[PDB]
A paper describes a structure:
The noncanonical [name] enzymes [name] and TxtE catalyze the only known direct aromatic nitration reactions in nature, making them attractive model systems for the development of analogous biocatalytic and/or biomimetic reactions that proceed under mild conditions. More specifically, TxtE is responsible for the production of 4-nitro-l-Trp as a precursor to the dipeptide phytotoxin thaxtomin A, while [name] supplies 3-nitro-l-Tyr for incorporation into the heptapeptide tuberculostatic agent rufomycin. Previous studies suggest that these transformations diverge from the standard CYP catalytic cycle upon reaction of the ferric superoxo with nitric oxide (NO), likely afforded by an NO synthase directly preceding the CYPs within their respective biosynthetic gene clusters (BGCs), to yield a peroxynitrite adduct. Herein we present the first structure of [name] alongside a series of computational and biochemical studies investigating its unusual reactivity.
[name] from [name] was therefore expressed and purified according to methods adapted from Tomita et al. before being crystallized via vapor diffusion approaches. Generally speaking, [name] recapitulates the highly conserved CYP fold and comprises 12 α-helices (A–L) and five β-sheets (β1–4 and β6). The largest divergence can be found in the BC loop, which is commonly implicated in substrate binding by CYPs. The BC loop of [name] (residues 69–86), by contrast, displays minimal secondary structure, with helices B′ and B′′ almost undetectable. Not only does this comparatively abbreviated loop increase solvent access to the active site, but our data further indicate that it likely remains ordered in the absence of substrate. Instead, we observe unusual destabilization of the F helix (residues 153–166), located at the distal face of the Cys-coordinated heme. The ensuing FG loop is highly disordered, as is seen in all structures of wild-type TxtE solved to date, and molecular dynamics (MD) studies of the l-Trp nitrating enzyme suggest that it may play a crucial role in orientating the substrate during catalysis. Beyond differences in large-scale structural features, the active site of [name] is substantially more hydrophobic than that of TxtE. Many of the residues that form charged interactions directly with the amino and carboxylate moieties of l-Trp to promote substrate binding in TxtE (e.g., Arg59, Asn293, and Thr296) are replaced by nonpolar amino acids (e.g., Phe69, Val283, and Leu286) in [name]. In addition to changes in polarity, residues lining the substrate binding pocket of [name] are generally less bulky than those in TxtE, thereby increasing the volume of the active site by approximately 25%.
Author numbering: 11 to 166, 181 to 394
The structure:
Amino acid sequence: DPLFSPLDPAVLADPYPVYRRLRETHPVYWHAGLDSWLMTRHADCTAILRDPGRFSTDFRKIDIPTPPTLLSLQTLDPPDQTPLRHLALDAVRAQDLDALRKELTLFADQLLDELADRESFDFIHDYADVFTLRAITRFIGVEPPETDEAFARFNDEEPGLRARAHFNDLVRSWLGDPGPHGVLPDVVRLLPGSGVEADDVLVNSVRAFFHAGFEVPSRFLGNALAALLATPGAWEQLVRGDVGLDTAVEELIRYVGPVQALARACLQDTELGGMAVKEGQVVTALIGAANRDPDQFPDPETLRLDRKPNNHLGFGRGAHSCLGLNVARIEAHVTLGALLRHPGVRSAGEPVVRPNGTLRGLSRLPLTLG
Ligand code: HEM
Ligand SMILES: [Cl-]
Ligand SMILES: [Cl-]
Ligand SMILES: [Mg+2]
């Protein structure tokens, strides 16, 4: 594609200038390769996410079958998704976030204090993945299986179907013998009377919940630090106390939030950006691009850690909006405060970007804490 190739190495290195220039000329662009419309403006993406009867997550409504092991909260739309959405909401909001902050603060300090002895380490492998895996396991209330303590088989065909079937077996065992605390034990207690059947959709939803709370936050933590180190003065601003962590975390989500694209199936003919989107077509909300839309954010390509207001789309919108956003904020807030407790945070090599145009993240972030 002459205007946007998500996986072109030069694009992956810095996709935002490409996003910007696509937005300036074709804010609603039909991409033949991806076979989808590409919306790069905040207003269009917002409208795509807030009309489920017009833009659905259930691609069966345009007659594309859903694999049985992937029918879940994420691939259902109201009213089918409603009971599961509320059950998951109820289970999450029963969790003690203050207790989670306190124990994550401990873990972060332990990890970094051990890594402080290295001359150079990979922040992704040694912190982001380890930190976020501990957080999601504790939050859900399950223990890593001794034979796959990192859940590596499920990080992602028959192998694929076998991994998801194995994970579903673990979930059913968890549901049958819940631990003393966490989202999953609360789901079990809340399930009777929820309008949700303990069936494959529930099991699949627990699997999706785990992935939503593992790979996405891990990728964000890496992206955020990389942006702080690559933006002159950004880290020093934090070290000096010039900006508050709360606003800085929200600006980092807008600036380099990992979710780049949210696909929806068009169920009704709609005109967007002067383009005739037709029923049966796929639309992709490039929320990574929308979060740098100059119509919504002044100086959008500039990292302003004190930015206010900041109506970013990094946590989605509407019926499928993120349910773990307060956990994600605690994780980022804890990580930054823990890093700030070290006097020499600096890069120690070039970052390496994952070849992913949908969920942006780094595979290596060489770093040293001094
Ligand atoms: C920086 C971290 C995170 C970011 C940027 C993020 C972002 C998002 C976004 C954009 C969506 C919307 C997906 C869509 O509309 O299709 C979403 C959905 C979701 N997120 Fe997060 N998320 C993060 C962390 C978490 C964590 C830690 C959890 C679990 C505790 C979580 C649980 C979920 C769930 C369950 C959904 C699906 C809601 C539904 O489909 O009804 N997220 N997230
Ligand atoms: Cl402590
Ligand atoms: Cl219209
Ligand atoms: Mg730039």
